[PDB]
Structure formats: structure tokens, C-alpha cells
Amino acid sequence: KLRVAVVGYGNVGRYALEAVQAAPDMELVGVVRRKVLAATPPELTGVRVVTDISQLEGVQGALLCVPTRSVPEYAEAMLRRGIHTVDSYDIHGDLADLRRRLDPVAREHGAAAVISAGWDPGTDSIIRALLEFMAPKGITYTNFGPGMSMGHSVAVKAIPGVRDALSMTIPAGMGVHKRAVYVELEPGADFAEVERAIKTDPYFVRDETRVTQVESVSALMDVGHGVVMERKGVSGATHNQLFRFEMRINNPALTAQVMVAALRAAARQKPGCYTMIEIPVIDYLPGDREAWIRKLV
Amino acid sequence: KLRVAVVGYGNVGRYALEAVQAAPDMELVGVVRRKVLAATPPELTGVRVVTDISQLEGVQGALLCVPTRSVPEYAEAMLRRGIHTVDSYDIHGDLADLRRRLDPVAREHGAAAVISAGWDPGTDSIIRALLEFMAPKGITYTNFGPGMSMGHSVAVKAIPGVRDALSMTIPAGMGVHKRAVYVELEPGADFAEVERAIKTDPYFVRDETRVTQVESVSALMDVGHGVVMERKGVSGATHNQLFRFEMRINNPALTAQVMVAALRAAARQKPGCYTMIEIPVIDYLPGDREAWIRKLV
Amino acid sequence: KLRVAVVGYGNVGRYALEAVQAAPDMELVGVVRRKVLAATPPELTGVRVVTDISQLEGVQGALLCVPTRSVPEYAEAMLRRGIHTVDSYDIHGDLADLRRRLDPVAREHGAAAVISAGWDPGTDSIIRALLEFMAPKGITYTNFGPGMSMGHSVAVKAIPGVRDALSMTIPAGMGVHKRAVYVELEPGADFAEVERAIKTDPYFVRDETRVTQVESVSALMDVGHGVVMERKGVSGATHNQLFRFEMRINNPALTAQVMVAALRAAARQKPGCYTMIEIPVIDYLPGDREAWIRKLV
Amino acid sequence: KLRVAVVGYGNVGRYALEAVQAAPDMELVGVVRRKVLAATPPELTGVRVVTDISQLEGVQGALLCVPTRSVPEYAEAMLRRGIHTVDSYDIHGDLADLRRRLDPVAREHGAAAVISAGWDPGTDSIIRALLEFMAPKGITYTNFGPGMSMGHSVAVKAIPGVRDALSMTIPAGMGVHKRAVYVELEPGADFAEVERAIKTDPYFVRDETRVTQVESVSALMDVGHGVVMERKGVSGATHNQLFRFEMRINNPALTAQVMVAALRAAARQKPGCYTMIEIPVIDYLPGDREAWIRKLV
Amino acid sequence: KLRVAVVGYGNVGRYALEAVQAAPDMELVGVVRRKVLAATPPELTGVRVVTDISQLEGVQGALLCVPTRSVPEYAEAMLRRGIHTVDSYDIHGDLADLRRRLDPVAREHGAAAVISAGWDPGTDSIIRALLEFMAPKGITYTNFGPGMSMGHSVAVKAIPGVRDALSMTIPAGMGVHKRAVYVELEPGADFAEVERAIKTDPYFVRDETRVTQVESVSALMDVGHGVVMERKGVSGATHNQLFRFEMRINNPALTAQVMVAALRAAARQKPGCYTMIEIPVIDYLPGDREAWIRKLV
Amino acid sequence: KLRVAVVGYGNVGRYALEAVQAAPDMELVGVVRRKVLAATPPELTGVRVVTDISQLEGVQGALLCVPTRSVPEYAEAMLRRGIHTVDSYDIHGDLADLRRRLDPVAREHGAAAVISAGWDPGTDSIIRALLEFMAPKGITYTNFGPGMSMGHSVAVKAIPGVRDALSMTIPAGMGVHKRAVYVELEPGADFAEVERAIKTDPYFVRDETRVTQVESVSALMDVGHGVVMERKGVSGATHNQLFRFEMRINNPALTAQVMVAALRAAARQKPGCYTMIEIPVIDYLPGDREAWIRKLV
Numbered sequence A, B, C, D, E, F: 001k002l003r004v005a006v007v008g009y010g011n012v013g014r015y016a017l018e019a020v021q022a023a024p025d026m027e028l029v030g031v032v033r034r035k036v037l038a039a040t041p042p043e044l045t046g047v048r049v050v051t052d053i054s055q056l057e058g059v060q061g062a063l064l065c066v067p068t069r070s071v072p073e074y075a076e077a078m079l080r081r082g083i084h085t086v087d088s089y090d091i092h093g094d095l096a097d098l099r100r101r102l103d104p105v106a107r108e109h110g111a112a113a114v115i116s117a118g119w120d121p122g123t124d125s126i127i128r129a130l131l132e133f134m135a136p137k138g139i140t141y142t143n144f145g146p147g148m149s150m151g152h153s154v155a156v157k158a159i160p161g162v163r164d165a166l167s168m169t170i171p172a173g174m175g176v177h178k179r180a181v182y183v184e185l186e187p188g189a190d191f192a193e194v195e196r197a198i199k200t201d202p203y204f205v206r207d208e209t210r211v212t213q214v215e216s217v218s219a220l221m222d223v224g225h226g227v228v229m230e231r232k233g234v235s236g237a238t239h240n241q242l243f244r245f246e247m248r249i250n251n252p253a254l255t256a257q258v259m260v261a262a263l264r265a266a267a268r269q270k271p272g273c274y275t276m277i278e279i280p281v282i283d284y285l286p287g288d289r290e291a292w293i294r295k296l297v
């Protein structure tokens, strides 16, 4: 049974606690937070919560449920302690570089790191790889939403006159996305100004963006999300092969569960850093291989 | 470039030829048939066709496009020659045992074998594994068709009074399948009896079966097929996670293309036998890993 | 404009009245009924209604909106008067013979008859013909409903213990249909007996049938109906060509409109009898061909 | 059997070869190409290939699988030799005029010509005509794709800084289409300039267009295509009649098969030129009419 | 049995007549029109038609099928006569104020008024309320069409050079709508200018608008319409609850039927004015409550 | 702010705790359980838990999250204490009688009771009522699943030789349902026996039932569920009006949230007992009516 720690008790972190507790081959040693207040969250009543992973006895693996930009530093800190790490780093543009950066650190400390192990990047990545070799010629389209965007939401809220905001990702089709922004204005903030400020912002200038002022943004929030991946391609020399994959899921819940499966896999790999398509899928399953082969193949 | 041979020029074999010719990292050395007639099929005009793989110079990998029951003997024959092998062996209840049987043969002759590498078993198996770890609790349903059934058609054609027949697999839902049989009666035969013999045959006795007599079975044949895989499960402790995968494809065309990708992967493994869920998905992709990670993850 | 008469003021007849009035190239001369009561239906207030088509001056075409079994004698009666005729005779197994029977009658009296011109048989027939030549090899499935069934309902009301009944046609998929019967029992009739008689009747004996006793059958009546026609076949030697046609329509409304278009075509044909697939489609369109070619091709 | 020749061995031509070989009522006499090299394509090994149709003995019909702008001269050349002709000329705005031009040429040489016989124009045209008379009032929407666009792709390759390109037709709904262009730039060409030139070109100027630079255009090519035709209209005076037709097919494969069926019909017509809606649908079916009436109506 | 009068014999009024005649608990006393010509519409032959509701003996309820702007004055006129009233007033931004305006008028004359009782506002409003309390946090999207737009069509028809026009409402998703305008130009008018005047008009300036010139607008008219309402929200603290409601209906037919049900409810309320969400749903059903509870709950 | 108690800390009870805590107009006073163990569930750490509702100060309303058969006694016990009550009693056959039984008890103690307030019975009941008056003639079909059935599951588990079981409700279409049973056998229990015992049981004899033996039933459980309600009917005299409502939700989560909304409504009613269709929908919404009318109608 793998001794694991949840690092970062945020949205994903809260679901990670549950995923670890539900895992048959793992034991939750504790949670690592930046601060630990006297008032204990109800669900953490019988859970060890500290600020230093060192105080969690025999930790073998860590789920890095921290902000994207904090992942690099956290992974290196855990790896240098010989602790296997998993994160759902979501920047497609440079996770490949993150992989090269963490590989030597992981190896030199006898640990394994699996990066970008959420649903996208993550499991969606595996699916895209499958579609790619099943029909080498053609185009795969990944359509996200409806669901909220963390990055886009923060960007809008950082605008003067904006008390709080919600940015919805809407699938327009063929891999194109539009934005539906909902904003809660400050004292005498002018909507027109805020509206153009949003549409102009580099985060929305590239896509069709619509803005709406609301009384309460919190009243509109839901972490449900989804994706539709499609490919029309050529298998060998045979055209029009049609594939479609769709999910309607709780975003953080799925991410945390995939992270758990990835940490299970990490503990079984040779020291180094890996993305999800570099690990045999059976390594994400608990227990002996034989039974899974008979049940799933 | 991997030198490959197509063994068995049947339905899948014909597509395998095309899949190999289209692969950027493979070279088709030739085709192995039980017999080679003087009348050369048009598309094989510039292709080396022989009855013994030994006559195909420098073959490194073999695509075993032979009947399911012939796979075991063919795989051992090729492996004992040090030739990597791929097959799409389709018996879910026995493939695990085939794996154990071929493992030492492959290993002792420095070769790798990837078995059951079609779409089901095969790629569908990978998808089922993903759904399984993304939402550990729940049920996955695999719905096949509409499409023609392998053995079912032969089973009916073996009935007295049946000139030729076609058995369609029809999805009834919840992983249950119906059978739509089309028969071309032999001069004199009685439909009523044939209809009874079919519905009572062990091959159909367990599923809803409907029989129809037709003037020509050939006029009804189409190798298109498909599948709908669904799962409603729990990620961690979060219920109602919804997943759906569907494809509408040319059956043998997809199978042959997956076999090609699997052979590419086999050549990159340690000697032994593997099912598709025991191989990192990136090994099914041609060339350098880096490029694929940046493109797909 | 073509002078037309509506024969039989029933369900389809009521809609035919409207279809003719809306046609830009036709003039409604009148309606022919078995009897004409003193109480005139509101919508027929300004319409000539008689018991003999001879009383309708200059009639050139007749829409035979009479029961299926009455069509043969009605068509011969009209044709022998030199009047073009259209009907939506719905017996697929007898259709061809009706064509042979009416052909010489129509020809010898210088008139044209278009039979079975509803949506099925009728327009669905044309679609089936199209799918057949677009992909010669494969299977076309015609799935009807949900919608009320003609004879099935009358057949149920035929049993003694039934005051009124409604038989719904339910698509089970792959061309198979289920029956949902609703019955209003006579005071004292046993439901169990009726339920048994229904499922036993040769009208439901070979189809999954379910019975439900209801307070009022009239409260469940709706003339909406539909169809889904699908085909997965081979174009040339290319497999898995996928086609799908679906309609959700008012049954008698569509039937009456198709009959109108067919009568327009009939007036354009050489004397004789025709099914809808024996007439160029442009003949079903009003006016000059040139305009339609530019608008539709 | 009708003796037929395939003129133009391009995309559609390659499929036409197969469609003719599979036709039960036709005999492939040969293929006519602009040039015949010493290296014979494998599939043409046992086929007569020449540069002048006169070298193909007893040819009665010709499938003109040449570029759109070449159809007029090719059709007149064949017709003046008394050879029936079929083409899938795709310009909706000129179609009618081509018909007028070829009609007297066909007639004076005792031959029949069926123009624009692909799926659109072609079979889609018949479907549009059906929907039009089934519900005279309303609007029919024809939504194409996803699939590759003919001229659009060549038009993009027309710009200087483009080595190769692919233009995808994307259905935006309600008969509106979007463009997804993929370009492979020449060493040194500026993407910004190309992107601008594309969106500016009169081919995309009036449609939402998006451009993406790609490593390889060939790796994105797939000949699959499709259409969704819908109409909500009035049958008689009854509103909201709903119709829907959809296809997911191999573009050239379907086009070639329709051309074959149209040539069969042409040989059955009085000398002159016809579009597909001017021919009874049963004429597109092989053999005796009686059998088809019983099987399809 | 409630004695009812239909006020305004327009689109909705014509259906209201039928809805009242079909209601088991209502008696149609007559129709109130602005003028009554000597030429009686066929369907009104046995119906009392007058210009003053006072001539309709014992009227207890009135269905106000008049233009939106006329509703206020008509409702106050009927209420001041002690006659219960129902209207489908469609202005979402002002109906709350209409409610406050009519409340004291209805109360002081012992009558009840139910306003905005169509499908939207109306039944859609009830559905939105249900979704709102079933999942308090999240967003509900109401997508209309395809279907003809009320004011939009009139707004275009008021443009110089426009003989007649039709404005189609097209759902773009996420509660956003597109406009497809069809215009029939007056002899001489310039399309380019009309097209500009339309797209710039306040009625379309906020949505994507496309204009098309046609020979006949009447040939494109169909009163079918529809809606798709969706919500992804949080029930309690559980995210991703998914809801979807859709209908494809005859617009005025449904509106008139809902108005009838609302009038039935009005007659059962304490004097005052009500929107549809202020009435228990069982009050919209005819007769005794007990029977409905057993049949529907 | 309404002071509320959750009675019964089971599946629904656990979600009810969350729904009350999330409600803006309610205050959770505590939870009433049959027993209170020393080991406190983490999430109940800061919550008052007792065995007698009397120990919860100032309780005004109670959510009866107890077994169906316990509802009658619990409701009467709470009502006799002057506490408003809500339950999701799910027996369609006699909830009408429960209503008559609780009405006088509620009234005589100055309290209000809203029974059967889940999604079915409950919100689905409201939807069925709407469809009923929008189109009075026709048939509404309620299709449940996929999702688990509590009753059916218990019935199977009570069978000798059955360690544990799971009964899935599968929609077969048109209001017909099939059962997919999963069983975990005891020591030497014979499957064949258990299988027929299930198929024979009155709980499954009425429907198509399939049985499967599994290693672990708990590994297959998920509380997700759903429904598809459809109606094709007549509005007035206009046929083929089409309606569809679908939900994919967490079963207990939705039920608890609806119960909260119903308790809010109960507190606003005259003393007595009500089903959900007897309460204006706006009463299920928190706060003043004005704002909801403007936001939703």
C-alpha cells in the first residue's frame, strides 16, 4: 500500500483527498498546506494536516494539487526528497520542457514523476494518441465545454471595476472556442468600459467574446465540464474512418482521480519523468496485471 | 525502416498491405500465402508473393492476418525465426492464456509479440482501461454494430440447406446484442426448419434472433462496423461521471492499421509477449517521442 | 389549372381539400361523398359536395382518399370516365399487381393513374430507390413511428370485449416494430381475456405486443407519425457508406400533399398506370422545368 | 451489358473503375487518359488504357471523370461520336445552361447525356425536389461537411508563399459554411501575409475563415465528406412538417457510383440532355422494373 | 362550463377557437373582431362573431389574442366588465409592470387576469423556475428556433424598397441567436442598400444577420418553432447536474392551447393578476384534482 | 430564516445536510438519527446530532429522509409537533391516499406537509402536468435510467445464496423498462438457481431481466440516474406537437435539493397536505416574488 500525501487543499486537492481514501492500494498519510488554522475543516477532522511534508511519516508519493506556475518548484522539492510526484500541469506549450527539466532531478533522487496527468492534458492526450495511430491521416478536433475557465476568469477579475467574474468556455465547433463572460461590477464601475476591456484583453481578443453583467457571480458557478474529441481520417488507404469521444464530468473530481491513477503508475516506473502517453495503461490500474487483462482486453 | 511481411492475404491481409505501404517507417518485403497461382491479383503485380516467409529477405516483423484458430501456430512459427509478430486474435476468454503461451517462445528467440491488436480486442481494450481508472466504480457497456459477425455467419452457412448466409450484429443496449440473420437457401431446403435450427443453435440461442430468406446474400454484404462504449461511474467519491466513445469504421481496414501500429511497438519492446494495454501508447507512434509529446499531450 | 375533385372526405380527404386549395396549379371543383347530409361541415360551406363525380363540371383529376380495399374499384370507375387518378394504396405486397390491373384500364380510356402515392408507399419508396443505387450492396432499414397504426387499431376493436382501441407502432430498431395497444373495455369485459386475444391475433402474434386498459382512447389520439430510414452500404467497392433519412410529420397531411403532387405528375404522363419511382421527380413540381432545375439541382 | 469507358483516371476516375467493375449490367472496355506511361499502375494491369476513346472497341457510354471546366468539351466530343455521357459537373449556377448546350448535340447524334450526376449536384438534388413537393412552403437548408473543398484548396495554393494547402468546409448551420484552411509554407514565406491573402481572397472573403500553418498538408488529407439537409415546412395548410437527410460518405466513391447509375439511365433515354431530376428513379436501377417495384415501393 | 370569448381572430385567435372548442370544460360563446364583413370565413359559419363583447351572452372569460401593444388596454377593458382575461403578452422586460398595473383593476372588479401565458413567456417560464430550484447555482440557456420572428419581420418590411420580408430566428448556442432575413424587393429598390439598412437596424445590429433576396416570401412561411433549454448546475453542493428541455411545435397552436389552460386557472383564482409561475400547475388541468394527482404525480 | 432539521442520515439525508447548508433562507439546526455513536462522522463534527427532534431548538421544518414505509409515521409525528414536513415518498399507487391521510393531521396542528417531493414523484410530476395541458390529447412516456433501483436491489439481496446485489433500471423505450441484475454469490450458492429465482420474482417477472455474477457489487455502484420524458400530442386541434425533457443527475443529490425547495414552499402554505403540483412554482424559490418574475418569466 502506497503512502501518499495531498499537497494543496484547493478544488482539486479536496477531491484528491477523496480519491486517495477510495483507492484500494493507497493510504492517505496527510495533507500539506501553506498554513494550518485552529479552525479545522469538518472533513479534515481525522486527518493529519501540516505545512512541511517532512512531518508526514513514510510518505512515498505526493499529489501536487497546486497552481500551474507552482508545479515546477514543488515537483523538484518533492523529488529531491525521493518522493514520487504527480501533477496535472496544464500548459500544452511547454510541458514537454517541464518533462526534460524534471527527468534528471527525478532520476538522481531515485524517484518518478508523472506530469500533466489530468484529463487535458492527461487522459485526453492518450485518446488523441490512439486516434492518431488508428487513422494516421486526417484531423482531430478537441472541443471543450461548456465549463468554466480558471485562467480567463482570473484575468477578468484583475480588471479595475470588476468585483468578481466568471468566464465560460463554449465550443463553437472544429476546435474553435468562444467565451461567455459574466461580471459583477464595483461601486461606480462603467460596464461599457469593462466590456471592451475584456474583449480587447489578449485572453479574449483571439476569440468571439460576449459579456454580461450579473448581480452574483458565485450564483452561476458549477465545476462541471466536458469535451468532445472527433477525427475523420484514413486507416491505411481507407478514408472516412469516424471516431468520437465525449465526456460530461465534474472537472476537479476527474482530475484528482486521474492524478491518483498516475501516482500509482509513477511508483512502478524506473526513476525519471514521464507524460501519460509514456506509460503502459495497465500501470494505471491497481493490483496484478493478469486479472485486468482478462477483465478488459 | 522495419522490414515487414503480410501473412495471409484475406480481408484484413488486403488492408494490411495498404497500411504497411502507407507507413512512413516500414518497408513491405512481401506477402506470404498458402498457395500462389499463376494469375496474379492486379494490386500484387509489383509485390513479392511466396509460400514461405524464408523467401522474404531480411524480414523483421510479420502481420499475422490468418484465422483466429491459426494464430497460435503461426505466431510460434514466426517467433522461433526471431521475427516479431502481431495478430488480432479475437477470443476474449482465451487471449490471456495465449499471452502466457507466447511469452517464453518470443523471449527465448529474441523477439516480441503483441497479440489481440485489432479494435476489439485491441484499441477498445485501451479505452476500457482508461474509463476504468478515470472512474473506478461503475459499469462499462460495449455495444457493437450494426455490422457483420465473423463466426456467426459461418455457423449458419454450415447448416444443411443453406447456400450462403450473413449474420448481422445488432446493438440492443446495455451491452446486449441481437442477431439479424439473412440466408440464401439451397434448392429444395425448407426455410421453417433452417429458421428453427438457427434460433436454437448455441451461437444464437442466447440472443434475440430473427431470420430472413433472401435471393442474394452477397448483395447485402458490407464490412462497415462500429461500437459505442459507455460508462457512468464514480471518480473518487464523485458520482455520475459520464463517458462515451463511438466509432463508425471499415472493420478490416481499422484492424490492419492497428496491427501495423502494434508491430511498430513490438519492435521496440524487450523480448516477450504483450497485449495492447501493456505498451506505452507513444510506442504505437512512428519516430521520435519528443515531437509526439508536443503535438498530442 | 387542373380541375380536381377530392373523393372521400375522411382523414386524408380533409387534408387533401386543403392541399388542393393551396396548390397554385389546381382548382378544387368539389368533393365526392357517399352521402351529403343537410348539416354542412363549416369548412365545406363554400364547396360543392355531391355523391357522383359526374356532378362536378369538367373534372380532370381525382384524389382517391378512400379505404385501401376500395381503391381498386374507385380507380377503375374514375379512369373509365377519362379522369386521371391518384391514390395512396398502402399494401406493399399487392401494389405491383394493382399497377398491372389499372394500366390497361387507364390506357384504353386515355388517362393516367399514379398509385401508392403517400409517404410509404410513396416518397419513402423514392428514397429507398436512391439509397439502393448510391450503395448497391448493403441493407436498408425502414423504422416507423411512434405513430398510430391503421388496421391494427380496427383489428383490436374487432374483439367482443373492446369498446374502442388504439394501436401504436413502436420502432424497435433494425426494421423491427413493437406494438403498444390501448383499450377501452365494454362494461363487464375481462381485461385478461382481451389482453390474450390481442397478443394472439395474427396482427400482433409475431411482434412484441403490450396492452394497457384506459379510461378514454380518444384522449390518446394523435395523427403525428414518422420514419427513420438507414443504410450502411458499398458504393462501387468502397464500404461503410452511411445514409440516414428521418421525418416527424402529420400523417394524413403529408399523404394528402404527396397525392396532390402525384396527380400533377399523372396529368403529365402518357396514358397508363405508374408507381412514384416511374416518374421523373421534376414532374411532381408545379410549372416550368427550367426554373426548378436552377433552384434545386 | 452496356460497354463503358472511364475518362480521366483521377480521384473519381479511380473509384469509377471499381463502380463499373462491380455493376452487374456493365462491362469496362477501358480507361482513357491524357498520357499512358510505361509504368502501369498495379490496379490497371489487366485493363486497356489509351489516349483516344476510339481505341476502345464498341464503347456505348462514357463516364467523364475530368475537371469541371473540361466537362463541356469532353461531353460534346463523346456525344458527337454517338457515345452516351455522364458527368458530375458541379457548378450550380451554370448547370442549366450546360443542359441547354448539350441537348441538341446529344439529340443530333442519337445519344443521351446526363449532367451533374454526383451527390451534389446529383442525388441531393432529387432529395431537395422531394422535400419541395412534400411541403411546398418553407425553407430547405443544405449543410456540407466537414470535408475538403475542391477549388478552395487550389485557390489557396495559388498564392506565392504557399507550398501546399488544404481547405476544409465546415457547416456553421442554416446553410452557412465556415472555412478551416491548413497551409504548408515555402521556405521564407511570411505566415501573416499568407493568412491575410487567404481571408481576403474572394473565395473566403464572405465566409468565416481561419488559417493554420502546418508541417505537412498531406498528413491531414481525407476524402470523407457529408451533408445534412433539413426542411421545416407546410404540407397543404399543415405547418411544422419536419424532414432531415444526412450522409457521411467517401466523396469520390459516392460520386463515381452515382455516375454509373446515371449512365445506366442515360442509355435508357430518348436522345437529349438531362439533369437527375428529369429521369424516373427506377431507371437508375439495373434490370427489369417489376422486381424493383416489388422490392422497394 | 366556463363561457369564453376569443378576442382577435388572427394567427393565435384562429387556433384559440379550436382550443376552446376542444376543451371539455369550456363553451365558446363567440369571437370578437374589429369588423365583421358580409363574407363569413368558412370555419366561422356556425359561430357568433361581433365587434363588442357585450353582445356575447354570459361571457365569463376572454382570450386576448391581440397584438402585444394592445394587450394592456384590452385587458383593462375586459376586467372592468368583470370578465376574467388571459393574454400571452411577450415582452420580458415589462410584463412584471403589466402585472402590477392589472392587479388592482382585476381585483376591484372581481376578476382574475393571467398574463404572458404563451410558451415563452409562459410554460417555458415554469420550466426555468423548476431548473432554478432543482439546481440553484449555475446557468440556464434558452435557445430559440429555427422559427419566424414576430417584430423582426415587421421591422424589415417597414424598410423602403421592401415589398415583403421574413426574419428567421436561428439558435447559435449559449443563448445567442442569429438572424436569417429573406426579402422581396419592391420594383426598383437596391438590394445592397436594403441589406445595409437591415444589418444596421437596432433590431439586428446586435446579432449576426444575413440577408437573402427572394422572389416570394410567402413561399417560405411556416409557423413551426421550437426551443432548447439547458442547465448545468449545482444541487445542494453537488455539481454537474444536467437538464435539457426541447420542443418542436406549431407556434400559434401551442400558444392558444396554453392560453386556454391559463383561462381555466384564472377562473379559479382570487381576484387579481397572475403570471404562470404564481399558479399551482394542477389549476391548469380540467376538473377534479384527485384524478389528476393519481394520474400524474 | 427557516430553522430546519434533517431526519435520517442516509443517502438522501447526507445530501440534504448540504442542500440546507447551501440554502440562503434556511438554517440547519441539526440532524435526527436513530442512534448517535461516539465516533462522529467527520462532516458532522460541528453539527448537532440527536435522537429526538425535541432537542433541536426552535425547529420549524423537517426533511424526512427516511425509508418510504417509514414516511407516514414520521410525518404524523412531526406534524403533531407543529413542524412543517417534506418527504419524497415514492409510491405512485397510493401517495394520493397519503395526501388525504396527512391533510387533517397537518391542518389540526397548524402545519403544512408537502409529500412526494423528489424528482419522481416530484418535479417530473410537474413536467408531466405541463405537457398534459400544453397538448391534452396524446401520450406521455417516462423512461428511467440507466440507474440503480433500491427496491429491486433489496429484493434480490434477500434471496438465499446472494451475498450482495445491484439492480440496474434500463430504459427499453416507450415507458417500458428492463432489468440488469448483478449478484455476488455466497459460499456454495448455485448461480442457475439464483438466476431463475430472480427472473421469477414478482419484482422482475413483469420485465425483461438479465443476470450476471460478479466478484464485487460495491465496485459497480454509482448513484447517477436520469430520465427522458416525451410526448407527441394535440394542442387544440393541431397534431404532432413534440416535447422532450431529459435529465442526467446524481439521484440523491437532486432529491434532497427538491425536498429543500418543497420545505421552503410548505412554510408558505395554509395548514394542510400538498403534492408538488398543488403549489405555485414561485413558492419553491427563495425570497420575494417580484425579482423572480423579472428574472424568469
Ligand SMILES: NC(=O)c1ccc[n+]([C@@H]2O[C@H](COP(=O)([O-])OP(=O)(O)OC[C@H]3O[C@@H](n4cnc5c(N)ncnc54)[C@H](OP(=O)(O)O)[C@@H]3O)[C@@H](O)[C@H]2O)c1
Binding pocket: A007, A008, A009, A010, A011, A012, A013, A032, A033, A034, A035, A065, A066, A067, A068, A070, A088, A089, A090, A116, A117, A118, A119, A120, A121, A122, A251, A252, A255
Ligand atoms: N490537466 C487538467 O486536465 C487539469 C484540469 C483541472 C485542473 N488542473 C490543474 O489543477 C491545478 C490546481 O487547480 P485548483 O482548482 O485546485 O486550484 P486552487 O483551487 O487554487 O488550489 C491550489 C492550492 O494550492 C495552494 N496554493 C494556492 N496558491 C498557491 C501559491 N500561490 N503558491 C503555492 N501554493 C498555492 C492552496 O492550498 P493550501 O491552501 O492548502 O496551501 C490552494 O488551495 C490547476 O492550476 C491546474 O494546473 C489540470
Ligand SMILES: NC(=O)c1ccc[n+]([C@@H]2O[C@H](COP(=O)([O-])OP(=O)(O)OC[C@H]3O[C@@H](n4cnc5c(N)ncnc54)[C@H](OP(=O)(O)O)[C@@H]3O)[C@@H](O)[C@H]2O)c1
Binding pocket: B007, B008, B009, B010, B011, B012, B013, B032, B033, B034, B035, B065, B066, B067, B068, B070, B088, B089, B090, B116, B117, B118, B119, B120, B121, B122, B251, B252, B255
Ligand atoms: N480484434 C479485432 O478487432 C478483429 C477484428 C477483425 C478481424 N480480426 C481478426 O482477423 C482475422 C482474419 O480476418 P479475415 O477477415 O482477414 O479472415 P479471412 O478473410 O478468412 O483471411 C484469412 C487468411 O489467412 C490465410 N490462411 C492461412 N491459413 C488459413 C486457413 N487455415 N484457412 C483459411 N485461410 C487461411 C488465407 O490467406 P492466403 O490465401 O493468402 O493464405 C486467408 O485468406 C480474424 O479471424 C480475426 O481473428 C480481429
Ligand SMILES: NC(=O)c1ccc[n+]([C@@H]2O[C@H](COP(=O)([O-])OP(=O)(O)OC[C@H]3O[C@@H](n4cnc5c(N)ncnc54)[C@H](OP(=O)(O)O)[C@@H]3O)[C@@H](O)[C@H]2O)c1
Binding pocket: C007, C008, C009, C010, C011, C012, C013, C032, C033, C034, C035, C065, C066, C067, C068, C070, C088, C089, C090, C116, C117, C118, C119, C120, C121, C122, C150, C251, C252, C255
Ligand atoms: N401510403 C401512405 O403513406 C399512406 C398513409 C396514410 C394513408 N394512406 C391511405 O389513405 C387512406 C386514408 O384513410 P383515412 O385516414 O382518410 O380515413 P378513412 O376512414 O379511410 O376515410 C376514407 C373516406 O373514404 C370514403 N369512403 C368511401 N367508401 C368507404 C367505405 N367503403 N368505408 C368507409 N369510407 C368510405 C369516406 O368518406 P365519405 O364519408 O366522404 O364518403 C371515408 O371517410 C388510408 O386508409 C390508406 O389506404 C396511405
Ligand SMILES: NC(=O)c1ccc[n+]([C@@H]2O[C@H](COP(=O)([O-])OP(=O)(O)OC[C@H]3O[C@@H](n4cnc5c(N)ncnc54)[C@H](OP(=O)(O)O)[C@@H]3O)[C@@H](O)[C@H]2O)c1
Binding pocket: E007, E008, E009, E010, E011, E012, E013, E032, E033, E034, E035, E065, E066, E067, E068, E070, E088, E089, E090, E116, E117, E118, E119, E120, E121, E122, E251, E252, E255
Ligand atoms: N408568449 C408567447 O409564447 C407567444 C407566442 C406567440 C404569440 N404570442 C402573442 O400573441 C399575439 C398575437 O399573435 P398573432 O400572430 O395572432 O397576431 P395577429 O395575427 O396580428 O392577430 C392579432 C389580431 O388582433 C386583432 N386586433 C385588435 N387590434 C388590432 C390591431 N390594433 N392591429 C392588428 N390587429 C388587431 C385582429 O383580429 P380581428 O381582425 O379579428 O380584430 C388581429 O388579427 C402576439 O402579438 C404575441 O403577443 C405570444
Ligand SMILES: NC(=O)c1ccc[n+]([C@@H]2O[C@H](COP(=O)([O-])OP(=O)(O)OC[C@H]3O[C@@H](n4cnc5c(N)ncnc54)[C@H](OP(=O)(O)O)[C@@H]3O)[C@@H](O)[C@H]2O)c1
Binding pocket: F007, F008, F009, F010, F011, F012, F013, F032, F033, F034, F035, F065, F066, F067, F068, F070, F088, F089, F090, F116, F117, F118, F119, F120, F121, F122, F251, F252, F255
Ligand atoms: N421521489 C424521488 O424521486 C425519490 C428519489 C430517491 C429517493 N427517494 C426517497 O428517499 C428515501 C430515502 O432514500 P435513502 O437512499 O436515503 O435511504 P437510506 O440510505 O436507507 O436512508 C434512510 C435513513 O433513515 C434511517 N432509517 C433507516 N432505516 C430505518 C427504519 N427502518 N426506520 C426508521 N428509520 C430508518 C437511517 O438514518 P439514521 O441512521 O440517521 O437513523 C437511514 O440512513 C427513499 O426510500 C425514497 O422514498 C425519492
